[PDB]
């Protein structure tokens, strides 16, 4: 007597999906399992736009970029979340004209402008793009005094305010728009602010309230929080301030600097490139195994990289269009029961799964 | 290594008043001055005007009475006190952070108010020029010196000057003021002797022009947001006996920053010292002293926000301090020696000061602050000894607060001052500011 | 004698470009270093009128004799 193997039903891209194994004591039976990833990646994006008075010349570019970004998110992936916020600067004396007349409209007297605000989360992350187009169109400019703008407070709050913004366990992106330079820690001493930024979420009614109480955050602080929360920043800055943000790009890992203009191809291309470079890991699990039965795994990762033992269960690099092959061997030391049994082997975090039927002679 | 850290004398002021934000010596007897930016004051209608506390030494250091530099409240406006509906203060003294920079030289005292702002008569615009009072001859008379309170109104001129942000007394008594916000935050250095201030004083008119005043000229618009004068110091770099100014520019060159040396008689730039890393505040605090004992002053530059890769490659915020030694030909452009912090987010090098010959070996020493250093982020102050080869790379002593950490940072070491024989025993002494908890401890050299 | 216009400190540069275009079309010579727009060889009355108009628009301007 000897063992045998056969596949009940098979599907083309988890290539095998239903097979029956006629095991025997001391005779391992080995079968192949081929996997190819096809599910599109899920993505989250939060668009942070400056609104100081220097954005008057560039507001149309920002709005058109927002709509084009939403269109690309719809086109490239079936799963996406999108939201946006805004900022100008801390609300304290050296940075804003504090006279009572200019609190109403820091822009010119003829124009109408909203009063300044450190940061305002206009729209938490959501899966519907129609509201994103409708709500972005209603934004209006706001005034400020000094040329640099306090964006780093906004980036800090967006990074750390997890639940309110709506971040989930998924690849994250953050597009940053600005026509001018940036403040950073140590600038607050001019306005009598000395406490360093603690990094906690101080959002009340979708607005940053402790701007007057905490100094700006240093670049190291920002880098630490961004790395902890796994956010890839893309600076959609104006052509004028390209050099300073290019120098900043070196300090912050996993980021890129685009160009803000009526034509918005550059930042869109960076978004597409960031999406294409994503990769996952495949880990194979299995249901509870009956006594007197043993299993083993082999992995054939890309570039001919191969592993066995525990490493046979895992492949730490995979992308769309890539495939891996697994060799699984099943051995039994006896025949616990004449009646067959069914066990499930599926990869972690996926719906597709394999069913194997074990028979003992 | 001999500063008697086991039980230093401790001074305390009113709670929540930032007592000890800036400290200085006084020796017309001997006494210690402490700045209290947020302390309440008795002058009418002023909320948290700020005050400067005089704590005498020799007796029990427990008096710490305030100094009545000013008594008149927010001054009213001419042509609106009468022939108009209601009053309108022409100057807003509330929240002015008076005493944020207390500097004394001989019998004269300078107490600057960076955030003082005043509504102009021509238009209702309000801008923070800042002002500094000047006591002369042991409080015999008090002169208000506000050089940035000129006829140029808006930020395009000296409107947002915030003069008195950083100040220093030279050997000859000449006053120096660092206005970071002048000319759209290009910055400005203003100076004039006490005699000129006395000659040109005229309290009737709010706008007074001091004869013989020296000031940097407005530059091209490309140099905006330089913050020149964020931190100021004085030393002899020009070869002549006249003291030469040193000014910090933490955001001058694409935020790399640099520190300049200005001729003491014309304010023409003599040297430049570029930064090392983007957004590091190269010039947060500066000092000038003869560390190697050659007889020529040597520059020191702070950089609290500088980051460096860890042994595992992780970047961390430690800060750095640079040392430039003045050879007889002239100062070299590269830093002769660099000292790096250890604590993450330590802000090492955010407050520098000479100590004089504390160890008494013919070489001057230096103390470097670290407001957020230490295990508990209370703060820490190092002491780097001098020597023939330059400043030593290993701290000779480490000073930490004795009281347990509270729920808020103590900022211990955020403001230092030393090099004066306070105890009178023949060795220099140190004063350390701890304004986080409203204290200012004093150390003595055994 | 001379009029100075300061397009600095969180101000759109398109404003200064359009003012330069408008004044240049009227024949008054214009020069600019980076963003400090100035007028050369302008009469006192015309300079005062232009300064008043621009101040009404909300731009900070200065007159030099
Ligand atoms: C250390 O590093 C610092 C920072 O880089 C150096 O400081 C800067 O150096 C530059 C270059 O030397 C300076 O620009 C020059 O400034 C001088 C002096 O300008 C002042 O005096 C003038 C007297 O005639 C006056 O006209 C100026 O005012 C007008 O012009 C300014 C424009 O700056 C304008 O904003 C004002 O409103 C006025 O309209 C001003 O008060 C000046 O003579 C130079 O002019 C040159 O201009 C062109 C090129 O622009 C050139 O072709 C000409 O021939 C002429 O030479 C030039 O503007 C700058 O002022 C310095 N300071 C700052 C803060 O930037 C420092 O020099 C370095 N030191 C060392 C030792 O390396
Ligand atoms: C200087 O003196 C003024 C006036 O006495 C002090 O003003 C006080 O400031 C505090 C906090 O800014 C205020 O506290 C609040 O009081 C209300 C009710 O009194 C309380 O419900 C709140 O929870 C809060 O504690 C206080 O009202 C205000 N006025 C007075 C009369 O105390 C100022 O604090 C003093 N500054 C310093 C540094 O001591
Ligand atoms: C923005 O500019 C780029 C380059 O000038 C344009 O890129 C071209 O796009 C067309 C289709 O839109 C392609 O057929 C060309 O091959 C592209 N050429 C290059 C060099 O990129 C881009 O089209 C512009 N954006 C828009 C909206 O027209
Ligand atoms: C210089 O002025 C100070 C401040 O007035 C004098 O020191 C003490 O000041 C308090 C008031 O704050 C007085 O009550 C004391 O009597 C003063 N001390 C003495 C010894 O009188 C100081 O005395 C003045 N300088 C001199 C040389 O007298
Ligand atoms: C610093 O400025 C002083 C003057 O403000 C220079 O000293 C002399 O100044 C007079 C005029 O006041 C000139 O006639 C002399 O030629 C100057 N001395 C020399 C040696 O040139 C001084 O030179 C300046 N510093 C430097 C380094 O030149
Ligand atoms: C202004 O900053 C620039 C950029 O840092 C300096 O240019 C060079 O910067 C690199 C840093 O990667 C240095 O290694 C070079 O030595 C710099 N060039 C020179 C000639 O030193 C530039 O030097 C700075 N200028 C000033 C006046 O600070
Ligand atoms: C990995 O396995 C594949 C498939 O059998 C084989 O072709 C390749 O040579 C192996 N490479 C290594 C390094 O084992
Ligand atoms: C990971 O897989 C991708 C695609 O299969 C390949 O291009 C890349 O070289 C692999 N290795 C790394 C380190 O990304
Ligand atoms: Ca000199
Ligand atoms: Ca020396
Ligand atoms: Ca020594
Ligand atoms: Ca002593
Ligand atoms: Mn702006
Ligand atoms: Mn713009
Ligand atoms: Mn601003």
Residue numbers in the entry:
A (entry chain B): 63 to 75, 94 to 441
B (entry chain A): 1 to 28, 32 to 449
C (entry chain C): 1 to 65
What does the paper say about this structure?
Due to their in silico origin and outstanding capacity to enhance cell adhesion, we call them NeoNectins (NN). NeoNectin stablizes the EO conformation as does FN.
Integrin α5β1 is one of the principal receptors for fibronectin (FN), a major component of extracellular matrix (ECM) component that is extensively expressed in various cells and tissues. Integrin α5β1 undergoes a large conformational change from the inactive closed state to the active open state when bound to FN.
